[PDB]
Symmetry: D2
Subunit: 447 residues, 4 copies
């Protein structure tokens, strides 16, 4: 049966496919052939621009026009053509080569030099750079902006919930009070950390030739330094320079990228589980509309997808850097999957966003929940005792905590203590709700 | 960009799609809806068959026929229509109910009972069964056949190469010889162990209720036994029963299934790697001086297989863990049931293609064998030990030291205290002559 | 800094090491040399048994006495002697070999045959059977008993709370009522499944010799049938037999076993998180209430994570060995118990966690009484049976719910009065569906 | 059965545990107690040193001296005492407090402030910083030195062998020639790339108290800035500050760490494997031809995977804790030095293996000498330069079963139409001088 969203095996190209559309221009075969074409053209132009090669004479403005436009206007029909040529070639890169060959066929300047397309390059010279462009383009145009959307969402929830008291939960149970603003502030913080780390990750490439030794480049063209040629070329593409390679690129940097992305996804998983929890306690209710509990599912699915993402992200990151000797092709097919994990991630991200849009806080439920546990108020008293020398605070506080613990019992206990009456007054001005320690200011320090 | 095999973000529906097309009728959304319609229809049919339920009267051949054809003739436009009934439901399982009602409103008998569709059913009552049908159907129509073709390729090689002596590699270094056929035979054995293991795995399903206690069922129909209803209904689908569940089937059996599949995948990775090594050793040549054979289909296999496991294991580890009576993290996860099976598919096909290309180089293996005569030290020790000579290892710490040949072996042999029959036996020995029992071991696979 | 529970890097032989003591006779090096010695000895014995080998005559009752006692009494000092021989020999199997040849010389009839020890065998022939004995022993004497204890704990919670009604949570929000006994019974059922499965798993072994072809065996003794020898020996060791093999046992059965174990562990993780939750809602208390600290369940959770980590890794990596073999597995197998150990620390902990559990009835009942919206479900079905128009619109409009709200709404409909007395009978507490009898049929 | 390296379940404290001895002072319960005592003592010190706290007046060096000698001179029996106190308290953190107070009871100056030990802190304030010191300590003192030793080993294999020609293998089969030096140089480059990263990884601690809001701190001493207090105190430890936290540090930097470490481990896995391969080709030999055992690369390769499994697990699970915390991490953090532990063993083994490596130059040169077909490519390229039509199919018209030698190439290119300079350029080419730029890249690694 023909391919559609209904007939698709993978939900990424499946029911969730219209979310991931931006990756169809990148990690698909269309992206592969696209960046292959770009890189090949850039390679030819780079040749013609070198004075030491008289075989490719420097291009006129118009021919450069045809090439640049060939790279910029590249579309799905062209990819189709390459795929059709691949039937005859049986090599998918040589198919690109022929595609370009027949595209320049009518332009004398280009056709005459057309045999210098993919000159001295091995296939992975084109492939690894195509990949690099895939991952970089994805990172900047897609991933990072989403990370920013989520981050800003959590920051928003942090400013909105800033002064809202909350009864904290340690090993599932009531604990020293906080605010939701802060609980979001932490997530935002860690997310920002990973963001930074991901923007600082290196993205690497090479054209080294066959084994990386510039063998045929130098054998054919001793007049050139192909090291400088290679650096200039790889840097010309907006990529980073990896002078030491076997036939392939060792792939370490993709392990790095996917590691970071995985960390982010993990933090987000923690967030989704936590919000799932807060909803379970009815700390959250549905927002009114123009179109009531919140169905958690937006986060749920997100969580469910995030792991899946990691599942792939990890594996590649683990597998790719290992390739037998000078190379094995086990990586090639795997490198077709670069955008699957990311895809999952994307979905998850969006889901979370949606979830956040549905969230409204339930204030009076939290206020009451705090009102009903006055035991958290033992602690600050204890400290204020530990300062003034009152002996065995943990011994004396048991005379209270086990069991009514109202505000009356509390203030009575505080009255029965030996203490400067200013501290008595203060302690007696305490409520579990009002007592956040430093939360709010910390929430405000985030920006 | 519109969705094509070109614009697919993933190679499964991507470049490798024409391989996995068989899964499109199972694990896709189309398969999900297909088995949902199947389950709902069959369920209403059981509702009708029952004597205790008089509100749903028995069907004559006409309506039963219309339903059977509803299930069997279910197609892509039906599913597309169900997808169109969304944007309304916002609920994916309810769209099926609407679809069934409207489909069925033409025939009066099913028309008047049409509100008994999905009766006292939670969504997951349908979903889990649909998944079970997915897995069973995939296993029967795809997985096992392919496993069999693989084991048959491996066994083919085993039989062809049965008599062909091979210099073994331990620590990638020369060891006591063998036949290539034996080395294939082993992988075949492991494979078929995993095969009989997979055929023997339970595909589980349960329809009980929202929380699994048959609440609403008893609420409406207290005089009906819903446990017998459950067991019967689940077995009737070719599934097997889980009496005890929460709102969801706990998913353990999918963990088990994907675990077996993952083990098979592992064995096949061992095989692909090994054959890669043999090709690298120039032990294999091209089918028709000899020509190099390019083991891409093996690499392409071993690259995909791992990926397969990567997802498989995940669904094995993640799925069974669900908060309290349930959380929906599985709902989306279970749409991925076909991914690792897809990768596995592609790897299987690849490996088959790569075995199709295999020729053996006999002159080479014999040359290599004859260049290592040191392996004949071992059988000389053992005999020397049986006949009571002392310090055999140290006495062969004489013979080992230039490189060994047949002449030297004969000198050493004659230099020893042995029954002379045993001597001549030892001198009858060559690296190729010493395969142990391997030939008969290949012969004995049944 | 010599070795103590204190100075240990790993908590397995570390702080948690007095839990794992049962595994110190199995998966350690002491265990390794123990089972190696056993396998070697019995190999010798079986060589003596065979009639076609006259070079070692049969063992009388006394020599079998010395060998059997040699194997049975194996202690740490013996293992230290072996370990000492390992310095001179620099092959850890050859030290066991020299240790047996050494010990056996007390008896003349054995010393005569001392050179038939490890005859035709290759190291892995001994090592792999040693592993088999390791995993079998571990399974029967350790793992299965615990699994049974846990299962019986959960079952006890099931029989206890069987009648106790509980408000369900689907995606964390309230749902159709149930009993705790049920939710415990499900866990008990899954655990039962994995228990049966772990019982079913094969423990595999071989002595095929060097590369698995019986090269040397056949070279020395073309008379003997060494396949019957392999089968007979391997089965006599209590181990199931793998006929087709390279220098190593492919380890697949270890993958199967560890897979089952990890599945069980995962079930247990689900359980622990679930009890964490139930406690977090104050559904559980100690034995005014008293909050119970759910520490044993978290410490179970983590160590289960680690356990599954190791078990998984070994299961996936082990079966892959390059060509006829690579020795990468040789070291990894020293970790066969590691993951298991982790599991142990969980199994015990969860137990200690369950012993501290007592249910809060009043809390559950008061939670149920504050949700009558669950009763929205059953009514609907009844409405659907007697053919009331479009129920879900009506009910979903009808709902801040009371008893009288319900009673009123039920009286607002056209149904047999029988069904109105049936429905007016229901409370969210009263409405458990079939749960009780479902619990009753567990065992 | 008493604990000895013999009875140990794990080889880390087991058979392989004499290699890991360093970690015994870091990641153990001993190290936990040591660093705990350290951070508690320093906490008390900073408490005293603060003016806004009058109830802990500034120490003399008659006092802080004793404290410092408490931290620095810590030994095994202090840890033992603390353990015996954990026997009575049942809380393992409280025993550091008791121990500290029974140590301090003698000096009345400290004994009088002794109730301020661990003031306002909650257990993970101590624990997390203890962890930070564990990781940093191991990282500077243990891990990095080893990474350096390995990087230098490989660098030496690269610089020694730089000009030794080697026939490359892509998909296992002969490819464009290279040098050993280049092939090791790659590994060196990657390894260093990781080294820098691990060195640049942040290490974090918090000490904000219970939920991280400084609740009790401000309760007792509202006048102080405890954010200042926190930043300062955490930076004074040699660690980096994490202002935003729940009861526990998120354990992200642990993820980063173990990710980098796992990456390095993976590079070393690739290396061990490749070397295993080269040894399998007889490309390496012993040192005063003798056959070499790759048991060290098999051991390293073996333990690295376990290391990555553990580290990976800690990295994935640790950062996830329910709400303000779950204690599932508390036990898991006892395992911090397990993964590293494995790594350590590996790191050693590999080195040992590298110490056994000699190159066989003759074997390599000969294998190259049988491989002349590799010289095809350069010719093609040259042919493509001077415009010779369809170059690649002009060759490959040598698939000939006369194979290929120097005379064949010579004659062939003699037939070609080329300026004589390029002809003799190509005739001068042999597989062994065709290594290209390898030697200069190796040189430039410096």
């Amino acid at each position: 049966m023909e391919l559609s969203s209904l007939t698709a095996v993978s939900p990424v190209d499946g029911r969730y496919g219209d979310k991931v559309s931006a990756l169809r221009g990148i990690f698909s075969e269309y992206g592969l052939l696209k960046f292959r074409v770009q890189v090949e053209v850039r390679w030819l132009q780079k040749l013609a621009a070198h004075a030491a090669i008289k075989e490719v004479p420097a291009f006129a403005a118009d021919a450069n026009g045809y090439l640049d436009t060939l790279v910029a206007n590249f579309n799905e029909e062209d990819a189709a053509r390459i795929k059709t040529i691949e039937r005859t070639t049986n090599h998918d890169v040589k198919a690109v080569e022929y595609f370009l060959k027949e595209k320049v066929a009518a332009i004398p300047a280009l056709h005459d030099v057309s045999e210098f397309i993919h000159f001295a390059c091995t296939s992975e010279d084109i492939n690894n750079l195509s990949h690099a462009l895939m991952l970089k383009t994805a990172r900047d145009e897609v991933i990072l902006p989403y990370w920013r959307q989520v981050i800003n969402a959590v920051k928003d929830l942090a400013t909105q919930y800033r002064d809202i008291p909350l009864l904290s939960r340690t090993h599932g149970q009531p604990a020293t009070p906080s605010t939701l603003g802060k609980e979001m502030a932490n997530v935002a913080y860690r997310m920002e950390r990973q963001f930074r780390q991901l923007n600082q990750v290196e993205i690497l490439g090479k054209i080294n030739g066959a084994v990386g030794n510039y063998n045929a480049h130098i054998a054919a063209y001793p007049e050139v330094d192909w090291h400088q040629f290679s650096e200039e070329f790889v840097t010309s593409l907006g990529i980073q320079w990896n002078p030491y390679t076997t036939q392939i690129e060792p792939h370490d940097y993709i392990a790095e990228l996917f590691d970071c992305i995985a960390r982010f996804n993990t933090i987000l998983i923690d967030f989704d589980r936590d919000v799932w929890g807060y909803i379970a306690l009815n700390h959250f209710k549905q927002k009114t509309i123009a179109g009531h509990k919140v169905n958690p599912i937006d986060f749920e699915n997100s969580e469910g997808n995030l792991g899946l993402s990691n599942a792939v992200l990890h594996h590649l990151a683990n597998k790719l850097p290992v390739s037998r000797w000078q190379r094995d092709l086990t990586d090639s097919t795997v490198l077709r999957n670069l955008g699957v994990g990311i895809g999952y991630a994307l979905i998850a991200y969006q889901s979370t966003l949606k979830g956040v849009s549905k969230l409204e806080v339930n204030r009076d439920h939290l206020l009451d929940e705090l009102d009903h546990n006055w035991e958290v108020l033992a602690e600050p008293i204890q400290t204020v005792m530990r300062r003034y020398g009152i002996e065995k605070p943990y011994e004396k506080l048991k005379e209270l905590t086990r069991k009514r613990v109202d505000a009356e019992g509390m203030k009575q206990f505080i009255d029965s203590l030996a203490l400067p009456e200013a501290e008595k007054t203060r302690l007696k001005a305490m409520t579990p709700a009002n007592y956040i320690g430093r939360a709010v200011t910390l929430v405000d320090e985030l920006k």
